[PDB]
Write a protein that binds this DNA or RNA. Structure first.
Ligand SMILES: [Mg+2]
Ligand SMILES: [Mg+2]
Ligand SMILES: [Mg+2]
Ligand SMILES: [Mg+2]
Ligand SMILES: [Mg+2]
Ligand SMILES: [Mg+2]
Ligand SMILES: [Mg+2]
Ligand SMILES: [Mg+2]
Ligand SMILES: [Mg+2]
Ligand SMILES: [Mg+2]
Ligand SMILES: [Mg+2]
Ligand SMILES: [Mg+2]
Ligand SMILES: [Mg+2]
Ligand SMILES: [Mg+2]
Ligand SMILES: [Mg+2]
Ligand SMILES: [Mg+2]
Ligand SMILES: [Mg+2]
Ligand SMILES: [Mg+2]
Ligand SMILES: [Mg+2]
Ligand SMILES: [Mg+2]
Ligand SMILES: [Mg+2]
Ligand SMILES: [Mg+2]
Lengths: 218, 88, 129
RNA sequence: CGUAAAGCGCACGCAGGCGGUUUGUUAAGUCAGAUGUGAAAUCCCCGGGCUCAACCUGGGAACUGCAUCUGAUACUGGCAAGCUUGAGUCUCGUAGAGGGGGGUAGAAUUCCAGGUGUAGCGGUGAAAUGCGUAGAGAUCUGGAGGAAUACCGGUGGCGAAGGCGGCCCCCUGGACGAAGACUGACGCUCAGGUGCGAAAGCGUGGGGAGCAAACAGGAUUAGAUACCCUGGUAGUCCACGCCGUAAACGAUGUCGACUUGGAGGUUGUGCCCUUGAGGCGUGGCUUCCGGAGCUAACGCGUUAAGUCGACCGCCUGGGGAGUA
């Protein structure tokens, strides 16, 4: 039933025909996602994530879309998990070897930021170092303490994070996605039909997934 | 094309009854009436190739209908031939 | 114009199968029903039904085992332009026994396996694999 | 067989090929068995003898074919009777540069006559040929004649293709939509055959303003049988007759069925208070983008170059040659 609030889908004609089974369709030329259909799938996905969390694996929230980013740095960051709230640089997963050096550089500069060399040499070299540091922080943040490939991915949007989904499929990593009417399934192992634009709705998804992952191995 | 009054006259005079516009005799009679009427039009002008293509379609349709009737019921095929004046 | 209704039935199945349709629908006929019956008993389709009386309509329910379809390839053999008849000893077998060849024998439509057991040949309607 | 060679320029159509759906009958095709025949050798499968092998040899199998007899009746064919979904007829309307004939209107170019007025006009990259003091060019008035129809105008419309634009009348072809009635497979394709078929070209008789092959002169150039300039004949126009060809192209034959979507144009129609130019549907044609699939790739993609069926046309390395 309507456990959610009032989002009733999104999008209009930019609709992917593969979403037909999940569409209700009605008011003022806007597609209405069939909430009755998503509730069982959403619960089924929540259960699988709970199973993975009990196994103590990673889930990799990604919500590059602003107005959804911080909500992964919110209590979504709480759980001992990892996120990518900014541009997903191509190759973050399919070549972990090269990005390994980038995180190593990030780690070294974080230490230097408080204990090492941060004041020596001209203020100009100080400010470039800091702005370079924050560039690494916001580009690859929570992912810093990962140290290996994940065990699952959680994507707020599918057609907007297609690069991440494709890399996961290439490496055989399960993918759980919130697919809108405009988005494309078949790259996702567990589809969750639901609006991915509304701030209220996306928080609802992140809270529910956050809550089920709070319960780790127990 | 044939006038509404003219069309009704042939239909009632060749069909088994009124509103029997589909019978082969009615169809052949209607084509024959229009083919004969157009002979005057093409005697004059004589260069209206685009309209003559419509006339040839009438001739071809009538030939096919007549062939079907001859194969189906010879007796009706004949009686129609003399009534309308067609050679073969 | 419509020259080969049987090939029409076969391609309707093929296209609907590739489009992931749940069921396909078509005008009915004795021969179509006989062929559909053989497909059902061989496990290539779920079921079939006929409706209406003056214009009977035949509907087939297609089968999927996994994400992919069940009827891998369905091909017409004896077509109106060239009809194929085989003796008992020349009956073909598709992909080495796997899959069937629908054959219309003097005792009705049946598979190549069934016809070979009954010891009589006939017209090769189609191949299914 | 879009671009590598290959869809006839387009139609109509005889022979031919193929053909919706139900019942009965026949048993020609088809299928089953049997009989006769299918020479021997050879080839193939099972032993010996030449010491082995080659070679010789016993028996079988095979000779895939033909004829006859006896059966089977699903499919194809024949015959008889049906059915309405393919095809067609009727009723009422809609849009359209569809076609043939006749009439007529306005703008403009040229020419002829006259007026006013005076030294240039025209042309080019620059010039010159050319026109002008015998009065041009410019400007105004009157008249003659031919050709084409600004704006509307629109990947707009119509036509089988070629193609078809002022307005009016006459004769005439097709397409589409609403609802109902009618016939009852009457269908699709089509070698040969027949018809239509841009422009140029040809014959006879007219007409002739503008434009303009050929031709003439002036330029450019090393040359310039050209590009540029000034003139200009056939032709372009009309009637009748011939020609039968084009990058006649969507470089894509016709017909039928099936297969996710998005945005437009144009033309019908049903219902809902039109309660303005609205809302919900349902047909025809048409443009652009794209999914699966297909493709060498480019790209095509419900108007397929996707998945299929029927028939036709055509290709088999380049040149010689679409020539003798
Ligand atoms: Mg008519
Ligand atoms: Mg070429
Ligand atoms: Mg070529
Ligand atoms: Mg063509
Ligand atoms: Mg034809
Ligand atoms: Mg039949
Ligand atoms: Mg027989
Ligand atoms: Mg012998
Ligand atoms: Mg021996
Ligand atoms: Mg021997
Ligand atoms: Mg029969
Ligand atoms: Mg010919
Ligand atoms: Mg000409
Ligand atoms: Mg002449
Ligand atoms: Mg002359
Ligand atoms: Mg000149
Ligand atoms: Mg040619
Ligand atoms: Mg052309
Ligand atoms: Mg063109
Ligand atoms: Mg050609
Ligand atoms: Mg396209
Ligand atoms: Mg020649």
């Amino acid at each position: 039933m309507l456990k959610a609030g009032v989002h009733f889908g999104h999008q209009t004609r930019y609709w992917n025909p593969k979403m037909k089974p999940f569409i209700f369709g009605a008011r003022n030329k806007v597609h209405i996602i069939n909430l009755e259909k998503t509730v069982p799938m959403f619960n089924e996905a929540l259960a699988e994530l709970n199973k993975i969390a009990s196994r103590k694996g990673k889930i990799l929230f990604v919500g590059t879309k602003r107005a959804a980013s911080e909500a992964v740095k919110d209590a979504a960051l709480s759980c001992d998990q990892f996120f990518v709230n900014h541009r997903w640089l191509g190759g973050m997963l399919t070549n972990w070897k090269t990005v390994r050096q980038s995180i190593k550089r990030l780690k070294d500069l974080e230490t230097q930021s408080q204990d090492g060399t941060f004041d020596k040499l001209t203020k100009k070299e100080a400010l470039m170092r800091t702005r370079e540091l924050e560039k690494l922080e916001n580009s690859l943040g929570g992912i810093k303490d990962m140290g290996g490939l994940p065990d699952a991915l959680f994507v707020i949007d599918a057609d907007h994070e297609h690069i991440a989904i494709k890399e996961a499929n290439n490496l055989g990593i399960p993918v759980f996605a919130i697919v809108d009417t405009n988005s494309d399934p078949d790259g996702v192992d567990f589809v969750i039909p639901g609006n991915d634009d509304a701030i209220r709705a996306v928080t609802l998804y992140l809270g529910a997934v956050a809550a089920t992952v709070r319960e780790g191995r127990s | 094309s044939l006038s509404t009054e003219a069309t009704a006259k042939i239909v009632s005079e060749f069909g088994r009854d009124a509103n029997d516009t589909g019978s082969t005799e009615v169809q052949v009679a209607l084509l024959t009436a229009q083919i004969n009427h157009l002979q005057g039009h093409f005697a004059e002008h004589k260069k209206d190739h685009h309209s003559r293509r419509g006339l040839l379609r009438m001739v071809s349709q009538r030939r096919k209908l007549l062939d079907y009737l001859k194969r189906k019921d010879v007796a009706r095929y004949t009686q129609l031939i003399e009534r309308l004046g067609l050679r073969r | 114009s419509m020259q080969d209704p049987i090939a029409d039935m076969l391609t309707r199945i093929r296209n609907g199968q590739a489009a992931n349709k749940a069921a396909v629908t078509m005008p009915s006929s004795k021969l179509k029903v006989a062929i559909a019956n053989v497909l059902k008993e061989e496990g290539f389709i779920e079921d079939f039904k006929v409706e209406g009386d003056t214009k009977p309509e035949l509907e087939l329910t297609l089968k999927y085992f996994q994400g992919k379809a069940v009827v891998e390839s369905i091909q017409r053999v004896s077509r109106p332009g060239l009809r194929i008849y085989k003796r008992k000893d020349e009956l073909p077998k598709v992909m080495a026994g796997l899959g069937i060849a629908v054959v219309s024998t003097s005792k009705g439509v049946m598979t190549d396996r069934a016809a070979r057991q009954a010891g009589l040949g006939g017209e090769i309607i189609c191949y299914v694999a």
